[PDB]
């Protein structure tokens, strides 16, 4: 009857202690799969609105099931390997876990179930141990963590700090100590939201986060794993405040890959995305050193690079920006576009290049001719003379 | 299985 806040606070402790070691396939007597799926449906299907009694044994139950010390990885060292090609390792005993997660989730994501309940039974320590878990079971486990943390972040202003700080630590260690972690991606997604929704006038710390943590992160070798999730944060940051543009672009160039073509293209790809939102008044501060770089890409003997860079020319907004400033830019690109496009081994760029030169004429005939004039001249002397 | 061009 009305004697449940003792039957449940016992139906749980049953699932709590539990901890049936699923690494021998013995003791096949479920028990817990029930108590769990049971405590779930008992709070989902309009089965309640009064089960907020003082009983945070929900946490403890969760904690004792989830806070284990992740095992040694079953994947290779590194350097000669690519995590993108790691064999997915599922956590045996996911069933119990899955439910513990799924349950816990709907737990504090229900009405009437206030914050000031957990506010004293969900401390930094909880958060911290939660973060560590961000490390191996295919999305399956990480994903839940991802979501779980998100909401815990959105529901306790008196934690937001820590959650953030701690994540930065998880990041610094990644960038400068062990160039390995399995859930940067998941962690970035969470951050994406967090970023997108700060005080109108950005607080000092957030800028730091972007610069001392976010950008330097493009530095790592395993970028092909969370590149998209990252770029999003980088862009979302610019949309919040454009000011941070110069430093952002400058940084990317600072970190421009020189022995990693893939990452190179990724950079290029991430750069356009930034341009697409680049505020006109700022496309200038960057403009020069940026294109100074793009000119080098277009000339790259690496087709995929040369190509991806060259492709910046079918983008109207960029072409627009290049026009409103064609004066300073054209002379930067020109020498590399006009450069005997008949040299490449890849009989496909000459045309790709041409398309670009062409687009420059239909932007300012004068300059073009004027640049060609100079190019042809300087090229004569340095040829007439450079022959003795 | 790494990418058809060949695990």
């Amino acid at each position: 009857q009305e004697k449940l806040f003792i039957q449940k606070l016992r139906q749980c402790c049953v699932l709590f202690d539990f901890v049936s070691d699923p690494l021998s396939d013995l003791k096949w007597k479920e028990v817990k799969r029930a108590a769990l799926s049971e405590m779930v449906e008992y709070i989902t299907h309009n089965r309640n609105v009064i089960t907020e009694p003082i009983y945070p044994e929900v946490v403890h139950m969760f904690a004792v099931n989830m806070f284990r010390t992740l095992p040694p990885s079953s994947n290779p060292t590194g350097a000669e390997f690519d995590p993108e090609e790691d064999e997915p390792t599922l956590e045996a005993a996911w069933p119990h876990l899955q439910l513990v997660y799924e349950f816990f989730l709907r737990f504090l994501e229900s009405p009437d179930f206030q914050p000031n309940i957990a506010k004293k039974y969900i401390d930094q320590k909880f958060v911290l141990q939660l973060l560590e878990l961000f490390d191996s079971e295919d999305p399956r486990e990480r994903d839940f963590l991802k979501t779980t943390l998100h909401r815990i972040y959105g529901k306790f202003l008196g934690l937001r700090a820590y959650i953030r700080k701690q994540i930065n630590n998880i990041f610094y260690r990644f960038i400068y100590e062990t160039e390995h972690h399995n859930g940067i991606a998941e962690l970035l997604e969470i951050l994406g939201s967090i970023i997108n929704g700060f005080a109108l006038p950005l607080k000092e710390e957030h800028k730091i986060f972007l610069l001392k943590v976010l950008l330097p992160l493009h530095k790592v070798k395993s970028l092909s794993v969370y590149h998209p999730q990252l770029a999003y944060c980088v862009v979302q940051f610019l949309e919040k405040d454009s000011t941070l543009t110069e430093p952002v672009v400058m940084a990317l160039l600072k970190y421009w890959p020189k022995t990693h073509s893939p990452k190179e293209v990724m950079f290029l790809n991430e750069l356009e995305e930034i341009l697409d939102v680049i505020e006109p008044s700022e496309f200038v501060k960057i403009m020069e050193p940026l294109f100074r770089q793009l000119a080098k890409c277009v000339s790259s003997p690496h087709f995929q690079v040369a190509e991806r860079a060259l492709y910046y020319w079918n983008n109207e907004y960029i072409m627009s920006l290049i026009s409103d400033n064609a004066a300073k830019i054209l002379p930067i690109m020109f020498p590399s576009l006009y450069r005997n496009s008949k040299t490449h081994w890849n009989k496909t760029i000459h045309g790709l290049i041409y398309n670009a030169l062409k687009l420059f004429m239909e932007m300012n005939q004068k300059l073009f001719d004027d640049c060609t004039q100079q190019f042809k001249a300087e090229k004569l002397k340095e040829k007439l003379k450079m022959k003795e | 299985x790494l990418x058809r061009x060949x695990x």
């Binding site: 090609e85 160039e179 421009w256 890959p257 | 058809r4 060949x6």
Partner: protein, 308 residues
């Protein structure tokens, strides 16, 4: 004049054996000297047995080393590699350099053929390019090698009875004289005969088909039978696809596939194998696992990818 350089080579080789790359300079020379020797070779190279035929190596230098432990060393035993020297492995450079170094040296003891990966585009998409970058700082070594590749013979015939090639058969080719005509000195095309010989696979679907790869086709048994008879061939020796057992027979033991890169990409988990053709063309297969890797130094934190 002869030893003057032949000793310079002999050394280069010994250095490569320690898995220590040659200088950008040396690489250029090695390749020069290499073209001059590779030109003279036909598209359908005539190799007299006995010899051991080897498949893919994909820059897994050490397993290549293991390979030699299995079949003997050069030039004490004669070899024949069917392309795919670079990409995937962690030591493409050393691998290719060493193999090429041996060709320049023991010119009649080893035979290297072109593989679908001895191409500018693939090497750019599958590693080699970058490796050369991080190992030399520029793109010269890459260029110098990709250039040499062009001069690699597309096929080889062993004792007039065994046809060896990296890829497979081509609808554009019916007789060995056809291949002989072809002008191979050029990058591998996205379409055509040359490309076919380098990307085709045997199929269990009978009759010319569409390659799930993207190049070459998928010839069937009947096609093999036909081809062999028309040219007087007893065996189509090729390798271009991972065979979890090192080697695999297909099309009523008319064509056999031979992979030599154990645990390919350091992931696949296949065994590797080589095929020995004795004093009188007798089959004989040797399978082998990837050699044991050992290294006690402190696995430091690698230099940034943006360095240079």
């Amino acid at each position: 004049d002869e030893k003057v350089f032949t000793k310079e080579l002999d050394q280069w080789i010994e250095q490569l054996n320690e898995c220590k790359q040659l200088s950008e300079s040396q690489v250029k020379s090695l390749c020069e000297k290499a073209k001059e020797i590779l030109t003279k070779e036909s598209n359908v190279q005539e190799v007299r047995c006995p010899v051991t035929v080897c498949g893919d190596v994909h820059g897994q230098f050490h397993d290549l080393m293991e390979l030699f432990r299995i079949g003997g060393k050069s030039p004490d035993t004669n070899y024949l590699f069917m392309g795919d020297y670079v990409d995937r492995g962690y030591y493409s450079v050393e691998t290719v350099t060493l193999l090429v170094a041996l060709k320049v040296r023991y010119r009649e003891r080893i035979t290297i053929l072109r593989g679908n990966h001895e191409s500018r585009q693939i090497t750019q998409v599958y590693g080699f390019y970058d490796e050369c970058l991080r190992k030399y700082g520029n793109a010269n070594v890459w260029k110098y090698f990709t250039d040499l590749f062009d001069y690699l013979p597309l096929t080889a015939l062993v004792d007039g009875q065994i046809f060896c090639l990296h890829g497979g058969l081509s609808p554009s080719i019916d007789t060995l004289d056809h291949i002989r005509a072809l002008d191979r000195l050029q990058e591998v095309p996205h379409e055509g005969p040359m490309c076919d010989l380098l990307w085709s696979d045997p199929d269990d679907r009978g009759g010319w088909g569409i390659s799930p790869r993207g190049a070459g086709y998928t010839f069937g048994q009947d096609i093999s039978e036909t081809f062999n008879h028309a040219n007087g061939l007893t065996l189509v020796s090729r390798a271009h696809q991972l065979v979890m057992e090192g080697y695999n027979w297909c099309h009523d033991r008319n064509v056999v596939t031979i992979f030599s890169a154990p645990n390919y990409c350091y992931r696949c988990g296949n065994q590797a194998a080589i095929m020995e053709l004795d004093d009188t063309l007798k089959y004989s297969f040797l399978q082998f696992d990837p050699a044991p890797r050992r290294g006690e130094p402190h696995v430091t934190r690698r230099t940034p990818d943006y360095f240079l």
